[PDB]
Amino acid sequence: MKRTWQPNRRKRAKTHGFRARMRTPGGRKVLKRRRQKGRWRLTPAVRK
Amino acid sequence: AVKKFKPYTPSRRFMTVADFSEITKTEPEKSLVKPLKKTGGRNNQGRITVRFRGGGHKRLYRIIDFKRWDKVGIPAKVAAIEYDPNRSARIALLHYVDGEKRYIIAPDGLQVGQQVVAGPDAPIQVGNALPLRFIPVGTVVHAVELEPKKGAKLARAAGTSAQIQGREGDYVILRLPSGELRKVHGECYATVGAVGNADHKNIVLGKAGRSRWLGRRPHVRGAAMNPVDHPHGGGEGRAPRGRPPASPWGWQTKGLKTRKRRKPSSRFIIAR
RNA sequence: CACCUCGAUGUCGGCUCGUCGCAUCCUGGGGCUGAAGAAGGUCCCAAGGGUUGGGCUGUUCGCCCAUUAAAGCGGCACGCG
RNA sequence: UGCGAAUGCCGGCAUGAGUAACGAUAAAGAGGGUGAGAAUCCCUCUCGCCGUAAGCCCAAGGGUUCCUACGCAAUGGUCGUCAGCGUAGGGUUAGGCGGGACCUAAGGUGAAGCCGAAAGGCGUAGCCGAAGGGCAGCCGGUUAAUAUUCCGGCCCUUCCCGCAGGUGCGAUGGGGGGACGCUCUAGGCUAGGGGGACCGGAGCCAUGGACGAGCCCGGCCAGAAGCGCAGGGUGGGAGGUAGGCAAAUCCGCCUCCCAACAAGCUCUGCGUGGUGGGGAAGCCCGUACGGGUGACAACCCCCCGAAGCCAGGGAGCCAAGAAAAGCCUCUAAGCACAACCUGCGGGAACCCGUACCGCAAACCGACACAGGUGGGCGGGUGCAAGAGCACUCAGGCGCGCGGGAGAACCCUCGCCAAGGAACUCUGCAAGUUGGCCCCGUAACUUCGGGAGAAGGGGUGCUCCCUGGGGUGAUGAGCCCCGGGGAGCCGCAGUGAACAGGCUCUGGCGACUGUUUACCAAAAACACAGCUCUCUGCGAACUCGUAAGAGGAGGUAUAGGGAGCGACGCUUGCCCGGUGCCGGAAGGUCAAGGGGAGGGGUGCAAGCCCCGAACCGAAGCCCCGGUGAACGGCGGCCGUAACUAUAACGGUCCUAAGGUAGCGAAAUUCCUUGUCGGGUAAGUUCCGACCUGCACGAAAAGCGUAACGACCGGAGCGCUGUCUCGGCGAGGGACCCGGUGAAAUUGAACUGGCCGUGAAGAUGCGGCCUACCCGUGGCAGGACGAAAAGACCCCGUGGAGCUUUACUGC
RNA sequence: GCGAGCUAGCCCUGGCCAGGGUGAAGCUGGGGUGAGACCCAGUGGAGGCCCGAACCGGUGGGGGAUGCAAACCCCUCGGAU
RNA sequence: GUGGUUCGUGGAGCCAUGGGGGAAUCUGGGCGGACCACCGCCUAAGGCUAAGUACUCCGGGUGACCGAUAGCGCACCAGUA
RNA sequence: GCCCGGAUAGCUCAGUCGGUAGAGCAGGGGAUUGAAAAUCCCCGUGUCCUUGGUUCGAUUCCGAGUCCGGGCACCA
RNA sequence: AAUGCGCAGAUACCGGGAGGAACGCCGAUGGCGAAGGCAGCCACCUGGUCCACCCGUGACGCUGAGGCGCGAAAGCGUGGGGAG
Ligand SMILES: [K+]
Ligand SMILES: [K+]
Ligand SMILES: [K+]
Ligand SMILES: [K+]
Ligand SMILES: [K+]
Ligand SMILES: [K+]
Ligand SMILES: [K+]
Ligand SMILES: [K+]
Ligand SMILES: [K+]
Ligand SMILES: [K+]
Ligand SMILES: [K+]
Ligand SMILES: [K+]
Ligand SMILES: [K+]
Ligand SMILES: [K+]
Ligand SMILES: [K+]
Ligand SMILES: [K+]
Ligand SMILES: [K+]
Ligand SMILES: [K+]
Ligand SMILES: [K+]
Ligand SMILES: [K+]
Ligand SMILES: [K+]
Ligand SMILES: [K+]
Ligand SMILES: [K+]
Ligand SMILES: [K+]
Ligand SMILES: [K+]
Ligand SMILES: [K+]
Ligand SMILES: [K+]
Ligand SMILES: [K+]
Ligand SMILES: [K+]
Ligand SMILES: [K+]
Ligand SMILES: [K+]
Ligand SMILES: [K+]
Ligand SMILES: [K+]
Ligand SMILES: [K+]
Ligand SMILES: [K+]
Ligand SMILES: [K+]
Ligand SMILES: [K+]
Ligand SMILES: [K+]
Ligand SMILES: [K+]
Ligand SMILES: [K+]
Ligand SMILES: [K+]
Ligand SMILES: [K+]
Ligand SMILES: [K+]
Ligand SMILES: [K+]
Ligand SMILES: [K+]
Ligand SMILES: [K+]
Ligand SMILES: [Mg+2]
Ligand SMILES: [Mg+2]
Ligand SMILES: [Mg+2]
Ligand SMILES: [Mg+2]
Ligand SMILES: [Mg+2]
Ligand SMILES: [Mg+2]
Ligand SMILES: [Mg+2]
Ligand SMILES: [Mg+2]
Ligand SMILES: [Mg+2]
Ligand SMILES: [Mg+2]
Ligand SMILES: [Mg+2]
Ligand SMILES: [Mg+2]
Ligand SMILES: [Mg+2]
Ligand SMILES: [Mg+2]
Ligand SMILES: [Mg+2]
Ligand SMILES: [Mg+2]
Ligand SMILES: [Mg+2]
Ligand SMILES: [Mg+2]
Ligand SMILES: [Mg+2]
Ligand SMILES: [Mg+2]
Ligand SMILES: [Mg+2]
Ligand SMILES: [Mg+2]
Ligand SMILES: [Mg+2]
Ligand SMILES: [Mg+2]
Ligand SMILES: [Mg+2]
Ligand SMILES: [Mg+2]
Ligand SMILES: [Mg+2]
Ligand SMILES: [Mg+2]
Ligand SMILES: [Mg+2]
Ligand SMILES: [Mg+2]
Ligand SMILES: [Mg+2]
Ligand SMILES: [Mg+2]
Ligand SMILES: [Mg+2]
Ligand SMILES: [Mg+2]
Ligand SMILES: [Mg+2]
Ligand SMILES: [Mg+2]
Ligand SMILES: [Mg+2]
Ligand SMILES: [Mg+2]
Ligand SMILES: [Mg+2]
Ligand SMILES: [Mg+2]
Ligand SMILES: [Mg+2]
Ligand SMILES: [Mg+2]
Ligand SMILES: [Mg+2]
Ligand SMILES: [Mg+2]
Ligand SMILES: [Mg+2]
Ligand SMILES: [Mg+2]
Ligand SMILES: [Mg+2]
Ligand SMILES: [Mg+2]
Ligand SMILES: [Mg+2]
Ligand SMILES: [Mg+2]
Ligand SMILES: [Mg+2]
Ligand SMILES: [Mg+2]
Ligand SMILES: [Mg+2]
Ligand SMILES: [Mg+2]
Ligand SMILES: [Mg+2]
Ligand SMILES: [Mg+2]
Ligand SMILES: [Mg+2]
Ligand SMILES: [Mg+2]
Ligand SMILES: [Mg+2]
Ligand SMILES: [Mg+2]
Ligand SMILES: [Mg+2]
Ligand SMILES: [Mg+2]
Ligand SMILES: [Mg+2]
Ligand SMILES: [Mg+2]
Ligand SMILES: [Mg+2]
Ligand SMILES: [Mg+2]
Ligand SMILES: [Mg+2]
Ligand SMILES: [Mg+2]
Ligand SMILES: [Mg+2]
Ligand SMILES: [Mg+2]
Ligand SMILES: [Mg+2]
Ligand SMILES: [Mg+2]
Ligand SMILES: [Mg+2]
Ligand SMILES: [Mg+2]
Ligand SMILES: [Mg+2]
Ligand SMILES: [Mg+2]
Ligand SMILES: [Mg+2]
Ligand SMILES: [Mg+2]
Ligand SMILES: [Mg+2]
Ligand SMILES: [Mg+2]
Ligand SMILES: [Mg+2]
Ligand SMILES: [Mg+2]
Ligand SMILES: [Mg+2]
Ligand SMILES: [Mg+2]
Ligand SMILES: [Mg+2]
Ligand SMILES: [Mg+2]
Ligand SMILES: [Mg+2]
Ligand SMILES: [Mg+2]
Ligand SMILES: [Mg+2]
Ligand SMILES: [Mg+2]
Ligand SMILES: [Mg+2]
Ligand SMILES: [Mg+2]
Ligand SMILES: [Mg+2]
Ligand SMILES: [Mg+2]
Ligand SMILES: [Mg+2]
Ligand SMILES: [Mg+2]
Ligand SMILES: [Mg+2]
Ligand SMILES: [Mg+2]
Ligand SMILES: [Mg+2]
Ligand SMILES: [Mg+2]
Ligand SMILES: [Mg+2]
Ligand SMILES: [Mg+2]
Ligand SMILES: [Mg+2]
Ligand SMILES: [Mg+2]
Ligand SMILES: [Mg+2]
Ligand SMILES: [Mg+2]
Ligand SMILES: [Mg+2]
Ligand SMILES: [Mg+2]
Ligand SMILES: [Mg+2]
Ligand SMILES: [Mg+2]
Ligand SMILES: [Mg+2]
Ligand SMILES: [Mg+2]
Ligand SMILES: [Mg+2]
Ligand SMILES: [Mg+2]
Ligand SMILES: [Mg+2]
Ligand SMILES: [Mg+2]
Ligand SMILES: [Mg+2]
Ligand SMILES: [Mg+2]
Ligand SMILES: [Mg+2]
Ligand SMILES: [Mg+2]
Ligand SMILES: [Mg+2]
Ligand SMILES: [Mg+2]
Ligand SMILES: [Mg+2]
Ligand SMILES: [Mg+2]
Ligand SMILES: [Mg+2]
Ligand SMILES: [Mg+2]
Ligand SMILES: [Mg+2]
Ligand SMILES: [Mg+2]
Ligand SMILES: [Mg+2]
Ligand SMILES: [Mg+2]
Ligand SMILES: [Mg+2]
Ligand SMILES: [Mg+2]
Ligand SMILES: [Mg+2]
Ligand SMILES: [Mg+2]
Ligand SMILES: [Mg+2]
Ligand SMILES: [Mg+2]
Ligand SMILES: [Mg+2]
Ligand SMILES: [Mg+2]
Ligand SMILES: [Mg+2]
Ligand SMILES: [Mg+2]
Ligand SMILES: [Mg+2]
Ligand SMILES: [Mg+2]
Ligand SMILES: [Mg+2]
Ligand SMILES: [Mg+2]
Ligand SMILES: [Mg+2]
């Protein structure tokens, strides 16, 4: 049937994107933690 | 006058639509229409603050004149009477002689062509707005300002009307469509007559769908829910109220009075 | 009563499939009779085989309808998911 | 710091086992080629399948999967020489297509401003934001792979700078416009389609016949100006002018005029059109595929015809149907040796996307997964129509294991003698019925329905006659709707396929709707409608600490809350308790006020403690009201001239003791109540009675036409449902070749009976049976597997829910 | 702190619903009357109207149950301005 | 009305402060645990101030610390697949 | 089968601190009436259900028993 | 008599206001209408009737099954109103 992943490149960057994170202090802290852990990508990989 | 239907389908038995005879113009005054944001009952957080609201025909706001003194003594000819999807009443389009066109809420009796005018001058005739203090006692009157220059706010629904009962200094004694007796300041404007489209109260929607067209979504009884949702929810089968009848927010809903007692306006009220 | 089983022994009835017991419903053998005959009554031997189709109710049971030599009772985790 | 257990952790390797599977029952066969190797790759022929798709084009998503060359370890459910796989190389070209140097929508953001302990929340303008608005490219050819992108032909747009000619020019400001619903719809066209006796074309004459106006193939596409043919939009002048937040000559308003179902201006569509392209079958080409020829190809006539175009067309209706820019006009500063407008020239015209998949082996589903995925095209013939069904074009496919075999059993399917629900919880299932035309059609009804009620008759082909339409012309042709009469053949003419079984009677719910994604679709929710209640507008109410927002740019014919749930006839009594409402008195009552009077220290002046009256709100008490507010709505004894029963009486209690109507009911325990009906037989069903365990009037009472994948009872029709089974088909199951799992598993050399044993033993006792090992089958046992039982209890375990439990907010 | 790319509601903007039936009002004509109501025709084309694809569903049954599938398949069924 | 302190209203002071009231400048004020008296200590409502103290992303030195299931999650292109 | 309530005049019922117990109706006797009612005057019988026990004394207090009324019989 | 109302300030009295219904005297055994029925006062629209005159038409008449219209009170529907 219709599964839970309905990909939408705008959705992805609008929701979990770098500019998305940087507005909320909750999301800036997401980057903080992700960098401190040394993730290769802080934000989900997206393609305009 | 009001249209009925033959029962060629169920819900057409009892369906009833208004009589659009007094309607003269179909498309509205383009220079006098705004778009209205449809809330679906949601506030500026994305939350519902009025339940069971949404859907319903797209509507275009007719910007209408509730302050009539900004054209004192300038008369105008009643050009049209048109449908307004945003109120119970019908609106009248009037062409002022100086070329401005405005929407007035159309009183009963008013028909196309007559002169109309606002101001302490004005003749006491249907359509004319005047400060209350110059409107003779016992005159039925609508679209009443509640405080001077704050705009008309009283009796503007179909077939509503206030009536002047007496005078007291700067105030005058009004009987409102709700039977309440209130003093209103004499300087408050009010166009004379009653609202009209007076048969609005007889239209019988007919089917559930017709409620949807007015943007009224279904409304579910507390008794139909569970205790998490409503004070009346739960039980086994059906179940009586089992307590003083209450709203979803737990306050009593039979008789319990809610006007703030300490309200300053209490000084100017005298009835029910 | 609370002995095995609550780190699980699926619970009524039906259907299918049976198998055994006998305290025998029928058929077979018999004693007594308040047994003329015919039909019974009751007890004895006997478990080889047989032991119907329908209405009602989920029903087991039971009651009816129509037959029958007869429309036996039980046990097998109230046999068998 | 010593491991055997912890349904312990990690890893490795077993068992089941060469076992189940190899992923749609659309289907294959042969020949040639290639290669170490071929059922599986290439090619030919034959066969099958899709064809409102299983073909083609967009969008999203994916991201090199595209093309070529070389490969086969692995991935591919087998094989592989093949690949969506490995290696390498190549490949995606735009002023006009999509998007950005344009607009605004919800929403987001957000100068000003408002709010919040901090983080932050709000917020007019502005900005951002699109599958909406605006805006200039069509068609062929070319490549292994791109093309509206390169090329060719023809045609446009914008910017800049010049000329030339015009005009008071000129905004982010004023106005017009853009600009709008649903349903139905006229005319004229276009796409698209069919026919042709005509134009063109290789060829063919088979097998009995046919050299014929024979068969087969094709007969077009893009196209500026100008011309037509349709349609859409729009009145022309003069005065007055206080409105459009300055100013307008513009708009609006007023008054004059001329004009008026038009015209004339425009604007779009369609046709023609310079020119430019295409151009079959077949046949020969060697391509996996394209080329050559057919050819100087022909390129016409008729008919059908949109849902598309003219389009802002028209009519009706109510629920009353975005915005902003481009665009036109108007004026303001400013400037008028500027500027703008109109043509014509030359120049200038950037960023990104463009491969390939794209109903799927490339997207979402862990898989080359029988699932899921939006827009457009979607031909032909027939069937009443149609996107329906059957076949079929273009195109695409045979589903990435095969070969046999011909058991049980399984699945999907076909038929069945006699019977026809006897099956069973239940006609579950399957059957029957089925399209169109015509005849006909009841109770009841809210007059619409019920109705497709029910039940019938017809349906093919041939010849003769014959009436209308549309198109041509009033005429022929081509279509479309028919009507009459003769006759032909079969078991059968909606000859295949698609296509209701019907009646009667109850319960519930008025109705179409809605719901437990994934065991409940319902009598549950909703619903129009009825009542109660709140709420005078900075409304009540809701969200938020707040600002603020929704309510509502609404105003008592309105909005919120509660119940009841079309409609019909109705909705009785009880206000003692609880709740809500009203009570300017009284009692009580907290802080506060007030201080009689006591007290501690000081030598005192003092300082400092308590503190009685009395004045003190809401609340409670108290007095009333209130039932579509929470709710409630009796007992015992007696009595009538046969009995029986009790209209009548007595008396106890209560706030008052259940009215109409209904009643063994979705309520009736006793119960299969009793009577009637249906049946041969009826714990069901229907009608009744009333003894109502334990109905009863808006948690509504009793009815009600119509509706229902709801639930019950009856019957007809018809059946493999059954007596009661049989045969057959295919897909599996079986054998062979290839690949090859799973839960489970203390170890096993794992029989029966009667006992015993923790009380149901392969494992102990006695006895009895019994050569070793497999294969196809069945399921009685291994208290078989699966899940640390969901029932039950326990734990001073946990959670959801309630309230006159406690305590708080 | 992260989630409405599934799902529920609402908001903005677009799109879809083959083909049949039924035949409300209104018109227009005729009758009717003092005038009407009303009646009959024809036209008209309304409806949470009817049949039925797409599309949205998920009624009954069978299959499936280490599945093709962690909700599928077949027949059947509901809605379809 | 509260917080802090050992101080949970307690005989409850001291320091802090949301609300109300509201002074004085040395013969002035605060404190020594209700309060008063005595006797003492201090000088509120302005500010700055090294060191001794805390920590370990990093550098070094050590180890009756590990030795690839240990030791950091990572000894290996790991916050990777 | 398991709990609670009651039993008093002929009927329906109050009642008690442990001593001689009343109400209403019915019934009886008188009155009024032509005669019945209705009205008026006057009149209780009670072994306070059975049985045991506490008392000086029990309808009263207690324990059982008959009888009646009410509530219960759940997961299963 | 009691229910009821009343020191929470009633009745009785004055003043202000709201509201609905019905129209005293005139008024009569009177008038009008076909009946049902009609009563303050003003206006508009409108029916019948009588009289005077003897002018017009010229039997155009009377009755009237059905049909159609009106029809006190009570009652019913949708709304409004609601003092007695
Ligand atoms: K509701
Ligand atoms: K409930
Ligand atoms: K157990
Ligand atoms: K036997
Ligand atoms: K047996
Ligand atoms: K089972
Ligand atoms: K282990
Ligand atoms: K093995
Ligand atoms: K390979
Ligand atoms: K596979
Ligand atoms: K756009
Ligand atoms: K402008
Ligand atoms: K042209
Ligand atoms: K391309
Ligand atoms: K097909
Ligand atoms: K075989
Ligand atoms: K049977
Ligand atoms: K059908
Ligand atoms: K039925
Ligand atoms: K009903
Ligand atoms: K349903
Ligand atoms: K529901
Ligand atoms: K608003
Ligand atoms: K009460
Ligand atoms: K009360
Ligand atoms: K009361
Ligand atoms: K005090
Ligand atoms: K009964
Ligand atoms: K009952
Ligand atoms: K009978
Ligand atoms: K009978
Ligand atoms: K249903
Ligand atoms: K077994
Ligand atoms: K406890
Ligand atoms: K229609
Ligand atoms: K303290
Ligand atoms: K201090
Ligand atoms: K001190
Ligand atoms: K000190
Ligand atoms: K410092
Ligand atoms: K290792
Ligand atoms: K590790
Ligand atoms: K009593
Ligand atoms: K007595
Ligand atoms: K008559
Ligand atoms: K009343
Ligand atoms: Mg997932
Ligand atoms: Mg890196
Ligand atoms: Mg506008
Ligand atoms: Mg519920
Ligand atoms: Mg919730
Ligand atoms: Mg609650
Ligand atoms: Mg409740
Ligand atoms: Mg529940
Ligand atoms: Mg209940
Ligand atoms: Mg109110
Ligand atoms: Mg035990
Ligand atoms: Mg076990
Ligand atoms: Mg036996
Ligand atoms: Mg024997
Ligand atoms: Mg036997
Ligand atoms: Mg039965
Ligand atoms: Mg029998
Ligand atoms: Mg037993
Ligand atoms: Mg037993
Ligand atoms: Mg059993
Ligand atoms: Mg081990
Ligand atoms: Mg390893
Ligand atoms: Mg095996
Ligand atoms: Mg096998
Ligand atoms: Mg196999
Ligand atoms: Mg396959
Ligand atoms: Mg071959
Ligand atoms: Mg082959
Ligand atoms: Mg394909
Ligand atoms: Mg992928
Ligand atoms: Mg390839
Ligand atoms: Mg190759
Ligand atoms: Mg392989
Ligand atoms: Mg390929
Ligand atoms: Mg490759
Ligand atoms: Mg630029
Ligand atoms: Mg913000
Ligand atoms: Mg913008
Ligand atoms: Mg666009
Ligand atoms: Mg091309
Ligand atoms: Mg390509
Ligand atoms: Mg091209
Ligand atoms: Mg100008
Ligand atoms: Mg064309
Ligand atoms: Mg054509
Ligand atoms: Mg055609
Ligand atoms: Mg030739
Ligand atoms: Mg021949
Ligand atoms: Mg020839
Ligand atoms: Mg020839
Ligand atoms: Mg063409
Ligand atoms: Mg003009
Ligand atoms: Mg101006
Ligand atoms: Mg024109
Ligand atoms: Mg050539
Ligand atoms: Mg139009
Ligand atoms: Mg702008
Ligand atoms: Mg040019
Ligand atoms: Mg492409
Ligand atoms: Mg593919
Ligand atoms: Mg493809
Ligand atoms: Mg493709
Ligand atoms: Mg598609
Ligand atoms: Mg494919
Ligand atoms: Mg494809
Ligand atoms: Mg495959
Ligand atoms: Mg697939
Ligand atoms: Mg996939
Ligand atoms: Mg097709
Ligand atoms: Mg056709
Ligand atoms: Mg057809
Ligand atoms: Mg098809
Ligand atoms: Mg083909
Ligand atoms: Mg397939
Ligand atoms: Mg048969
Ligand atoms: Mg037969
Ligand atoms: Mg028959
Ligand atoms: Mg039967
Ligand atoms: Mg069936
Ligand atoms: Mg069928
Ligand atoms: Mg009938
Ligand atoms: Mg009819
Ligand atoms: Mg009919
Ligand atoms: Mg034939
Ligand atoms: Mg059929
Ligand atoms: Mg149907
Ligand atoms: Mg029943
Ligand atoms: Mg329903
Ligand atoms: Mg329907
Ligand atoms: Mg469900
Ligand atoms: Mg659903
Ligand atoms: Mg189900
Ligand atoms: Mg279901
Ligand atoms: Mg607001
Ligand atoms: Mg209800
Ligand atoms: Mg004091
Ligand atoms: Mg008080
Ligand atoms: Mg009270
Ligand atoms: Mg009631
Ligand atoms: Mg009830
Ligand atoms: Mg009720
Ligand atoms: Mg109901
Ligand atoms: Mg009923
Ligand atoms: Mg009914
Ligand atoms: Mg339905
Ligand atoms: Mg069978
Ligand atoms: Mg067979
Ligand atoms: Mg095998
Ligand atoms: Mg052995
Ligand atoms: Mg044993
Ligand atoms: Mg041994
Ligand atoms: Mg031993
Ligand atoms: Mg042994
Ligand atoms: Mg043994
Ligand atoms: Mg075996
Ligand atoms: Mg074996
Ligand atoms: Mg088996
Ligand atoms: Mg087990
Ligand atoms: Mg468990
Ligand atoms: Mg357990
Ligand atoms: Mg459970
Ligand atoms: Mg506990
Ligand atoms: Mg606990
Ligand atoms: Mg979503
Ligand atoms: Mg959503
Ligand atoms: Mg419909
Ligand atoms: Mg349908
Ligand atoms: Mg479509
Ligand atoms: Mg869907
Ligand atoms: Mg299903
Ligand atoms: Mg369907
Ligand atoms: Mg503290
Ligand atoms: Mg001290
Ligand atoms: Mg070492
Ligand atoms: Mg490691
Ligand atoms: Mg490692
Ligand atoms: Mg007694
Ligand atoms: Mg005694
Ligand atoms: Mg008159
Ligand atoms: Mg004369
Ligand atoms: Mg009447
Ligand atoms: Mg009346
Ligand atoms: Mg009435
Ligand atoms: Mg009534
Ligand atoms: Mg009323």
Residue numbers in the entry:
A (entry chain L34A): 1 to 48
B (entry chain L2A): 2 to 273
The authors write:
Here, we report the discovery of a series of macrolides called sequanamycins with outstanding in vitro and in vivo activity against Mycobacterium tuberculosis (Mtb). Sequanamycins are bacterial ribosome inhibitors that interact with the ribosome in a similar manner to classic macrolides like erythromycin and clarithromycin, but with binding characteristics that allow them to overcome the inherent macrolide resistance of Mtb.
Two sequanamycin derivatives, SEQ-569 and SEQ-977, discovered through serial synthetic modifications of SEQ-503, showed improved potency against the Mtb H37Rv strain (MIC: 0.57 and 0.13 μM, respectively). We succeeded in co-crystallizing SEQ-569 and SEQ-977 bound to the T. thermophilus 70S ribosomes. Overall, the structures were similar to that of the T. thermophilus ribosome with erythromycin, and the active sites displayed clear electron density for sequanamycin in the macrolide binding pocket. The C5 ketoallose forms a hydrogen bond with A2058, with the hydrophobic C4-C8 edge of the central lactone making contact with the peptide wall, in an analogous manner to erythromycin. The overall structure of SEQ-977 bound to the ribosome is similar to that of SEQ-569 except for the carbamate group at C8, on which the NH of the sulfonylamide group forms a hydrogen bond with N1 of A2062. This interaction causes A2062 to orient itself differently in the SEQ-977 co-crystal structure, compared with SEQ-569. The additional hydrogen bond may explain the increased potency of SEQ-977 (IC50 = 0.034 μM, MIC = 0.13 μM) over SEQ-569 (IC50 = 0.054 μM, MIC = 0.57 μM).
